[PDB]
Design a protein around this ligand. Structure first.
Ligand SMILES: NC(=O)[C@H]1C=CCN([C@@H]2O[C@H](COP(=O)(O)OP(=O)(O)OC[C@H]3O[C@H](n4cnc5c(N)ncnc54)[C@H](O)[C@H]3O)[C@@H](O)[C@H]2O)C1
Ligand SMILES: Cc1cc2nc3c(=O)[nH]c(=O)nc-3n(C[C@H](O)[C@H](O)[C@H](O)COP(=O)(O)O)c2cc1C
Length: 359
């Protein structure tokens, strides 16, 4: 089984290639990491295993989901360290994903009912609905196009949040630039209609993620900085005329950052939509460093990816909700448990969160 061969993710020696994908569960009430988050990640942590924390707020204007954890306040830092300590006690590596929803927000999630910030003024079309705090579905409002000065302030919110994660004891951070959110609103030409230095050509549309990654690299070190992208996912109107060209464009900037800094990044996380599809390998071939593949991967598919050189690590999401011991279940080929979509974003600390049985 090549999924349980040791891999060196920079200064982090992992015992296997099974990675917990970042998964918003909406259990951090009032944007505060609750104690149930510790029990949730401890059920999933293994010795030498890599865990990726769910999307975490970098600013009071970064949320588009109910009860999502933050890392911009001291109170959230002292609540994150209590969970990082329990995960570190099991000998696991944990990364905190910095998440900014951009235009995928709502007045109920913004302070004083302000409009969500984005690269453009176009809102998400009406075929997508945002989850409301009361369980219903609302309408994505019209965002507000920010200038270059506000862009640098959001970049600083990434840098300040990256340092708070290391203060909380995290082994590193992952830049969430996928799934049609703030960073993905700049990369995809279907959303970025700007005429300044942040829109138009591939070089201009890659400037925001380059400044975001370069800021967190110079603050906490490149080897503790992860990057997640999704050039082919069209979620929340995140369409690109040439997804393969944009993926290679993002990789080129990531390689240039690794060369000018004299150090390698932690990894490059690429997730794909649920379905040839040779875009995953093509992006792996262009990137110089660790590659994590994501999107509809199973036990045989993950083993096939590592054995064929398609990826170094394989991250699993949905199966990690209903299988806390998914790492061990993959080893023994044990049957996996089914997951309940209804309890994906509920607020109960046990029901559909930690009540999933072990093997
Ligand atoms: N924070 C995030 O990036 C995630 C938040 C929600 C779920 N993620 C993605 O949203 C899409 C739909 O998730 P959801 O379960 O909300 O969709 P349904 O309502 O079931 O349709 C998928 O591409 C999934 O991977 C993204
Ligand atoms: C309930 C749920 C929450 C998710 N939250 C996040 C998130 O916070 N950040 C992120 O980058 N992806 C998030 N995702 C996307 C997962 O990474 C996605 O499931 C993964 O790319 C595909 O893995 P899978 O085939 O095992 O389901 C979420 C997905 C689900 C279903």
């Amino acid at each position: 089984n090549p999924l349980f061969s040791p891999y060196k993710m920079g200064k982090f020696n992992l015992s296997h290639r099974v990675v917990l994908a970042p998964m918003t569960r909406c259990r951090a009430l009032n944007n505060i990491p609750q104690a149930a988050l510790g029990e949730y990640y401890e059920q999933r942590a293994t010795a030498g295993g890599f865990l990726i924390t769910e999307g975490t707020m970098i600013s009071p204007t970064s949320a588009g989901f109910p009860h999502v954890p933050g890392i911009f306040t001291k109170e959230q830092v002292r609540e994150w360290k209590k969970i990082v300590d329990v995960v570190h006690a099991k000998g696991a590596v944990i990364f905190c994903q910095l998440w900014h929803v951009g235009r995928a927000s709502h007045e109920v999630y913004q302070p004083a009912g302000a409009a969500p910030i984005s690269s453009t003024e176009k809102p998400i079309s009406n075929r997508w609905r945002i989850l409301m705090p009361d369980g219903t579905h609302g309408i994505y409002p019209k965002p507000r196009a920010i200038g270059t000065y506000e862009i640098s302030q959001v970049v600083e919110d990434y840098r300040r949040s990256a340092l708070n994660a290391i203060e909380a004891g995290f082994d590193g951070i992952e830049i969430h630039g996928a799934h049609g959110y703030l960073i993905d609103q700049f990369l995809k030409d279907g959303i970025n209609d700007r005429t300044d230095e942040y829109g138009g050509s591939l070089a201009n549309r890659c400037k925001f993620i380059t400044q975001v990654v370069q800021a967190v690299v110079s603050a906490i070190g490149a080897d503790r900085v992860g990057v997640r992208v999704s050039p082919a996912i069209d979620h929340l109107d995140a369409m690109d005329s040439n997804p393969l060209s944009l993926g290679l464009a993002v990789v080129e900037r990531l390689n240039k950052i690794q060369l000018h800094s004299g150090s390698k990044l932690a990894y490059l996380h690429v997730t794909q939509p649920d379905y040839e599809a040779r875009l995953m390998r093509t992006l792996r071939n262009a990137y110089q460093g660790t590659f994590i593949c994501s999107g509809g991967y199973t036990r045989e598919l993950g083993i096939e990816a590592v054995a064929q050189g398609d990826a170094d690590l394989v991250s699993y999401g949905r199966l990690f909700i209903s299988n806390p011991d998914l790492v061990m279940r993959i080893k023994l080929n044990a049957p996996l448990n089914k997951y309940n979509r209804k309890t994906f974003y509920t607020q109960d600390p046990v029901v559909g969160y930690t009540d999933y049985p072990f093997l």
